[PDB]
């Protein structure tokens, strides 16, 4: 019964369509992420 249902539905839909949520996910998962995404060859061992 809250008057906030339709506005929040439309807000999340608008954000998804324009691309805000994806950017935030990139910001808090991949960016702000420690390890992102060549080593010299080693001599053979016994």
């Amino acid at each position: 019964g809250s008057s906030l249902g339709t506005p929040v539905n439309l807000a999340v839909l608008k954000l998804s369509e324009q691309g805000v949520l994806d950017k935030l996910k990139n910001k808090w998962w991949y960016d702000k992420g420690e390890c992102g995404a060549k080593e010299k060859t080693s001599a053979l061992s016994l």
Partner: protein
């Protein structure tokens, strides 16, 4: 300018491998000598 070391041609194989190669050479030679010159045939 990394100056390559003399005996850098040994770098592909570790020091232990060369050591044990020498040891195995000696053992092979001795075992061959033995198994060839023991039996009074």
């Amino acid at each position: 300018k990394s100056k390559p070391g003399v005996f850098s041609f040994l770098d592909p194989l570790a020091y232990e491998i060369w050591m044990c190669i020498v040891f195995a050479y000696i053992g092979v030679s001795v075992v061959l000598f033995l198994v060839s010159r023991f039996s009074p045939y």
